[PDB]
Design a protein around this nucleic acid. Sequence first.
RNA 1: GGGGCCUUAGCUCAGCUGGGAGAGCGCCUGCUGCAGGAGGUCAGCGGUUCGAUCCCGCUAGGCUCC
RNA 2: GGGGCCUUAGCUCAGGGGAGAGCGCCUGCUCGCAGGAGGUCAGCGGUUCGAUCCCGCUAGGCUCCACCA
Length: 518
Amino acid sequence: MSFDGMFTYGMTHELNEKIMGGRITKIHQPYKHDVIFHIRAKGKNQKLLLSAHPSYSRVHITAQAYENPSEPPMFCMLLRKHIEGGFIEKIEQAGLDRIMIFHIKSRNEIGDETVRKLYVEIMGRHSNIILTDAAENVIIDGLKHLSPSMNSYRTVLPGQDYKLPPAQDKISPLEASEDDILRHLSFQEGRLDKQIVDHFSGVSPLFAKEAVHRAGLANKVTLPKALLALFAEVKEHRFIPNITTVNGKEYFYLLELTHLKGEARRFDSLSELLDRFYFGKAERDRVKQQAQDLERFVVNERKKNANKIKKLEKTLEYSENAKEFQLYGELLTANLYMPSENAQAYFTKYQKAKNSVAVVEEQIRLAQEEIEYFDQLIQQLSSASPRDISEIREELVEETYESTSGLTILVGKNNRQNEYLTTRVAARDDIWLHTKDIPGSHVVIRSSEPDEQTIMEAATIAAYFSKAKDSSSVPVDYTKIRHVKKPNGAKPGFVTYDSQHTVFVTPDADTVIKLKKS
RNA sequence: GGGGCCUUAGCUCAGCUGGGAGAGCGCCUGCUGCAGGAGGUCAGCGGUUCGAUCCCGCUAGGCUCC
RNA sequence: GGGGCCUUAGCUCAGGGGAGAGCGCCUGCUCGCAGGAGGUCAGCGGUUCGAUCCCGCUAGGCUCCACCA
């Protein structure tokens, strides 16, 4: 994991630099596992994101806008009761574990000064945000409850004593000498990267591989020097925030990862890196989890129809072959003088077959139309926003951008928005865009003659909100709205179009974010 | 006795009142919590029909009901 | 079964004159500010110049009774 003890150390330093002494002005919880503190510090308003998400747990200052629920969750209201209005006195790391502790001076209901500790544990699935009394060391509440049945060592419930996770009894990299490295590392046993992780606290396999790489030939002379150099870089805050992309897979770190043969992009801090790294990924997995019941249903219903098609086909084939039964009783009728119920039984098998052809063919066609419908829904679910999931659910039961030139671009992200955009909002000569033979979002430029740059920007947006968002070249069709038509009885969003031109674009998240009107 | 309702995968139940057998939990696999697996004569039996938990015929059994 | 009481905005409650106030939630402003959000006044049909506040009924929720052989 890229968010390791060393990364936590660097983040803790950055947070102290940015928000120590800062007043918590507002607390929000936009998502189930994500809390946002609005902090007034050093003449600036900072947004601190605290994520206890199983896959995307992180702490950083974020520029991103987040939509808050109409009703704040109970944990948010609890945090507001205890620590909103308070001052962050200190931020510290628990050893070199992935646990940040925010010391927050607040006032009680009577007005007396109280100190609260906010523990932010970054442990993947077990990641948590826990508020305690500093005097009594008693848990006020945690974002995730841990019952004694789930963990015998530590309980995370209101009114219980806060206990850290079990210590790993590992050496501190920030205090380690050359002799400490030489005593603990068996240079003959191999897997030196693993040995480093086993002996040194806070060190990931990513860091350990970098250390082994920088050593060149990892031996008793080279590896201790490489480790101490890397530890010194961390201890002295000589951070180079970077993301390295190797074969489509991104790695982020607080130091340069020379062991990775890929394109390295540097940053002024780590927030932007994490925003980019987890952009789409956190949402897609959450959507996948919420959609899993529908997908399993939709995929089943699609599969059902294909199977239905196959059987009907066999009844059509039976119908064709049945002609034999017509022969059988014709011949039996001709030769009666030389059994008749057997003739008639064959004939009847024929007629039943023959009559099944037209019904089978019709039922194959209808099952094919259902497969196409379900294939469209599967794609829509893959690129949907949270609102789009609601609109698709309603169907199953039954955004503004500005170009570089200053032209308004409108986007529908679901079937209902797509229908509303194309049929009610868009003017007759406005330019409509959509991905060719790839399900996606309807995009409309509010201009009859947009410049080529605006077309490419709008196409990039269309491709970004399509199934092909991860492809290097995506075909996007565009035409005037007057050429786009909803067929009679078609579901919302579904349209036929003519007189189209196709452009090819690479989807880019940064371009889409830059063009988004606030 | 008279009426009433259900029997479905390892387990428990969905499924519109034919549109093509599912979920949750447990279990098996790998990953680092995730997906993906298995698994049903839909109690059984036989009509209907292009497909039947689905419609009806036809018997189990258990509950509801005096 | 009968009596007795209840049903107002997210929440808590004001209130025959055309449905408010605080808090929450939104507006910009940083312990106060500054404007919004939101009502079939349980419902019904009627008294009338107007009904949340008449009056008669229907819901529902509580409450008290339903005994004597």
